[PDB]
Design a protein around this ligand. Structure first.
Ligand SMILES: CCCCCCCC/C=C/CCCCCCCC(=O)O[C@@H](COC(=O)CCCCCCCCCCCCCCC)COP(=O)([O-])OCC[N+](C)(C)C
Ligand SMILES: CCCCCCCC/C=C/CCCCCCCC(=O)O[C@@H](COC(=O)CCCCCCCCCCCCCCC)COP(=O)([O-])OCC[N+](C)(C)C
Ligand SMILES: CCCCCCCC/C=C\CCCCCCCC(=O)O[C@@H](COC(=O)CCCCCCCCCCCCCCC)COP(=O)([O-])OCC[N+](C)(C)C
Ligand SMILES: CCCCCCCC/C=C\CCCCCCCC(=O)O[C@@H](COC(=O)CCCCCCCCCCCCCCC)COP(=O)([O-])OCC[N+](C)(C)C
Ligand code: NA
Ligand code: NA
Ligand code: NA
Lengths: 115, 115
């Protein structure tokens, strides 16, 4: 666990941040007027809400409907399906990067530094 | 990440499209009359709704109830449990196809093209 939370996951965050914060603005700005007659107009409102409602998406949690008040419902989705794919690709770089670590190291690495 | 978004995932989409668009019609047509007295009769209405409510299923998101207005609630499910399995099989072809790529390449591939 320790050699794994030092070497691979720390990378994955650092690139998972920049996309989340990156794509976060893109969908947090495409949203437009919140008519006060219809308050809590959209989940993606301020930037703080965009980061989380994307965060809930990654873990496999919540609900989604491509109707949120925006200027471009066609562009408002292309940046979202984007975030699904681009996120997903790294998660496959995750399991293989640890796969390329465990078959070489564990049986000799763990038992010895344990001693 | 780059060698992975060129070679394996591009395949997985191209077969994930044809099933999604394929099974999308099958459940988008089996649905029938939307009585205007009972509007938003079903999630699977037009084809555009079928693609997404299947899309939300794949990522692990949303809600499901096998009651949606259809002619055949027995056939309306067999095409759905179908889409769960057939999708799932490719995702196992994913992790193994990258597994059959990483154990051969990474330690020599990445460090060298990086130079
Ligand atoms: C590694 C990066 C750091 C890690 C952090 C880890 C923790 C994650 C961080 C989580 C923070 C979540 C939001 C905090 C709260 C809101 C305030 C805010 O920050 O935004 C404000 C201004 O800022 C913007 O609008 C942001 C625009 C710039 C994005 C910068 C990304 C840089 C990443 C580059 C990466 C380099 C990669 C280099 C590659 C070699 C706007 O916010 P607001 O709408 O006014 O606020 C809501 C109001 N409320 C709070 C009262 C409700
Ligand atoms: C690779 C394929 C392309 C990739 C695309 C990637 C992006 C994904 C694409 C997403 C598009 C999502 C829907 C768009 C919006 C609706 C319009 C539409 O297209 O359908 C319309 C007609 O068309 C049909 O009814 C479709 C029937 C033919 C299916 C063709 C699949 C071919 C895949 C073969 C693969 C070959 C494999 C070969 C193997 C070697 C009906 O729609 P509607 O109900 O009238 O519209 C709703 C109305 N509203 C919008 C106002 C609400
Ligand atoms: C694929 C599965 C695996 C991976 C999954 C991904 C894993 C995680 C990856 C990455 C983290 C992703 C960011 C999530 C943040 C969502 C919430 C947000 O942005 O806004 C919300 C909170 O906002 C804040 O609290 C602002 C940030 C405060 C600083 C602390 C950051 C915590 C990270 C610590 C890192 C520890 C590192 C130690 C371990 C090494 C809303 O803003 P607000 O409105 O101000 O607050 C609401 C309440 N209020 C209105 C009453 C005030
Ligand atoms: C297992 C986990 C990992 C894999 C997960 C799977 C990963 C993804 C796999 C595959 C993608 C799956 C398709 C999802 C589409 C759902 C929405 C839909 O069909 O209809 C909706 C939108 O419809 C549209 O927007 C129509 C399509 C527009 C073209 C852009 C396609 C974006 C793909 C870009 C590809 C980027 C490639 C770059 C990266 C290489 C509804 O139609 P509407 O009613 O017209 O719109 C509603 C709003 N309105 C009423 C206000 C207008
Ligand atoms: Na899940
Ligand atoms: Na879920
Ligand atoms: Na694995």
């Amino acid at each position: 666990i320790q050699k794994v939370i030092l070497h691979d996951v720390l990378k994955f965050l650092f690139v998972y941040i920049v996309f989340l914060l990156g794509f976060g603005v893109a969908l947090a700005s495409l949203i437009e007027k919140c008519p006060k007659d219809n308050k809590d107009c959209s989940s993606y409102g301020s930037f703080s809400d965009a980061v989380l409602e994307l965060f809930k998406l990654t873990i496999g949690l919540g609900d989604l409907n491509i109707q949120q008040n925006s200027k471009y419902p066609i562009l408002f989705l292309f940046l979202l399906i984007t975030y699904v794919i681009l996120t997903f690709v790294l998660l496959l770089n995750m399991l293989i990067a640890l796969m390329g670590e465990t078959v070489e190291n564990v049986s000799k690495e763990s038992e010895r530094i344990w001693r």
